[PDB]
Structure 1
Amino acid sequence: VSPPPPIADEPLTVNTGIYLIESYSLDDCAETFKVNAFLSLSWKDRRLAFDPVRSGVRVKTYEPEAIWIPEIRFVNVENARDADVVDISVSPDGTVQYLERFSARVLSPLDFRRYPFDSQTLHIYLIVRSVDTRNIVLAVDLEKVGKNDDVFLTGWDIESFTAVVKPANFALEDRLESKLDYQLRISRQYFSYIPNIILPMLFILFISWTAFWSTSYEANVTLVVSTLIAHIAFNILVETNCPKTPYMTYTGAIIFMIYLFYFVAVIEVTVQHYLKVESQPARAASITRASRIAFPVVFLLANIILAFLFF
């Protein structure tokens, strides 16, 4: 067996579809997700055409080995998918209806710049390589592209599963390659982030700010430095567990600013005490009183600037 012959000079159309059965193991660190789905394939092989009358059958079932089947591969997979041919059906005209169940660990880049208010498009790229006898081209039947209602990823809302209908046909190592883009659109469930991370982090910072209503240098040193320890401790607790991102994220910028604020509050506490000790209590008291407003105001403003820059 070799590819079906062209009637004219036309390429062979392999109609595809992917139906998600299970989506699992989305890994933010590895930028990978595990999928379990159906892969449907449809094409015409006139060599396989038959007279249903003089055959006594309206359909013919074949073993994968018995007939020509296109070699469809996935571009962005760790290793080749584990596939199980579910069914192969041939109709009197030579139409082949192929179906397999497969599992695969798909590599898809994730953008964490807007985390935890991010949305992602997961990609699954189907590909076919042409042979010398004839060019093979992929097509999508969107009726055949879907997902089980029960499919889920914890912490994400799965908006849709679709395919970009126009394939990407290009030459590679002297042969045409036809590629399809299947997209899984997901948006993060950011609720518990406010009470679980942000609010507690904010409270610690706010505690450090009470040093602006105290003249006790010993109590102030304990306030700013102990809260810095509590902040670091809290970040270890709520730690992403992923190796640090190469780029600056939204949450990343806020956290950097919180460290800057702890340093600035230490400078203030240091300045106020030095001024007091160096017989200048009027300047010390005026700085501390300004800080009471300057600190929350500069914080709230910089946060609005960051929110604006990222979104």
Structure 2
Amino acid sequence: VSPPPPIADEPLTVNTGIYLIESYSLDDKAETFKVNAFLSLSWKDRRLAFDPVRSGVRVKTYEPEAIWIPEIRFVNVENARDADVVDISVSPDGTVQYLERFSARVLSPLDFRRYPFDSQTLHIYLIVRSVDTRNIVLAVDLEKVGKNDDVFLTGWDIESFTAVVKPANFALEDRLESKLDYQLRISRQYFSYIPNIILPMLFILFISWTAFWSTSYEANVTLVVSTLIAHIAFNILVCTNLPKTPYMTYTGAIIFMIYLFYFVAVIEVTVQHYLKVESQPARAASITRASRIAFPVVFLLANIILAFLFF
């Protein structure tokens, strides 16, 4: 088999469509997601044209090996897609309608800057390489782009599944390549992060601040050091669900900043004890009373500054 010949000098247009059946396993650390979808392909092959009136058949069904099929691939997949041809239909003028159901693990970079209040644009890049005989170009049949209503991505809200209709045509290894960008827009369900990580992290921090209403050094050391260790546990827990980033994430910024609050609280607790031992408690009292206001105020203002810089 060889590609369909051009009537004049035009490239062969392969109309494409992706219909999502299932979306699952969005792995933040690996920056991958699994997809199960229909891939539809359509092109004109005049060598396959037939007469509807004489044949009595309006459509002809072929096996993939019987006819020429464009070699369509995915750019950003771990391994080649697991595909099963559903149907191949040829109309009298030779218009081929190809349909396959596939499953693939897609590599798509994620921006963690606003985590866990982040939104992502996942990409599925469709590609075709031109042949010596003729140039193959990709197009989007909007009527064949979509998703099943039941499509759910655990821990995420699916906003839209659209295609950038204009392909990216470029030369690669002295041959033309036609690339299409299918975009799956998602937003993270931040809900569970509030009662499980954010509020427990704030509770232990506020518990360390009770040391500002205590003169007992031994109890203060226990309050600030124990809560700091619990904060380290939350820092470790958060970083297990995330890859290492060359930038600060919103959660990472708050987590880092809270260490400074624990460090300064230890200094205050040390300074307070030192002064009391030195028979200067009136002074230790001034620092402790100021700390009661300073710590929540600086914490509130620093969080307003951080939320502003990130959102």
> What is the TM-score normalised by the length of structure 1?
0.97
CA distance in 2, matches of 1:156, 1:216: 47
- Cα displacement string for residues 194-250 of structure 1 (whole angstroms, at most 9, x for unaligned residues): 111111111101010011111111111111112112322344556644443332100
Change (3 A) 1:235 1:192: same
CA distance in 1, matches of 2:223, 2:58: 84
CA distance in 2, matches of 1:237, 1:104: 29
- Cα displacement string for residues 274-299 of structure 1 (whole angstroms, at most 9, x for unaligned residues): 11212322221100010000000000
CA distance in 1, matches of 2:244, 2:215: 39
CA distance in 2, matches of 1:165, 1:210: 60
- Cα displacement string for residues 236-276 of structure 1 (whole angstroms, at most 9, x for unaligned residues): 55664444333210000100011111110000010111112
Give the match for residue 226 of structure 2.
226
Percent of aligned pairs sharing the same letter: 99
Q: Which moved more, 1:298-307 or 1:213-222?
A: 213-222
**What 5-or-longer segments of structure 2 have no aligned partner?**
none
Give the match's secondary structure for 2:37.
strand
CA distance in 2, matches of 1:107, 1:233: 30
Give the match for residue 181 of structure 1.
181
Give the match for residue 171 of structure 2.
171
CA distance in 2, matches of 1:252, 1:280: 39
Change (3 A) 1:237 1:253: closer
CA distance in 2, matches of 1:129, 1:234: 49
- Cα displacement string for residues 73-132 of structure 1 (whole angstroms, at most 9, x for unaligned residues): 000000110110100011110000000000110000011110111000000000000011
Give the match's secondary structure for 1:53.
helix
Q: Which moved more, 1:223-232 or 1:186-195?
A: 223-232
Give the match for residue 103 of structure 1.
103
Asked whether the equivalents of residues 28 and 241 of structure 2 are also in contact (C-alpha less than 8 Å), the reply is no
Asked whether the equivalents of residues 272 and 284 of structure 2 are also in contact (C-alpha less than 8 Å), the reply is yes
CA displacement at 1:21 relative to structure 2: 0.6
CA distance in 2, matches of 1:237, 1:185: 27
CA distance in 2, matches of 1:299, 1:187: 28
CA distance in 2, matches of 1:55, 1:242: 61
Residue 5 of structure 1 pairs with residue 5 of structure 2: yes
Give the match's secondary structure for 1:242.
coil
Asked whether the equivalents of residues 40 and 99 of structure 2 are also in contact (C-alpha less than 8 Å), the reply is yes
Give the match's secondary structure for 1:79.
coil
Q: Which moved more, 1:186-195 or 1:263-272?
A: 186-195
- Cα displacement string for residues 122-159 of structure 1 (whole angstroms, at most 9, x for unaligned residues): 00000000011111000001111000001111111101
Give the match's secondary structure for 2:224.
helix
Asked whether the equivalents of residues 13 and 138 of structure 2 are also in contact (C-alpha less than 8 Å), the reply is yes
CA displacement at 1:68 relative to structure 2: 0.7
- Cα displacement string for residues 15-43 of structure 1 (whole angstroms, at most 9, x for unaligned residues): 00000011111111100011000000001
Give the match's secondary structure for 1:185.
strand
Give the match's secondary structure for 2:297.
helix
Q: Which moved more, 1:214-223 or 1:232-241?
A: 232-241
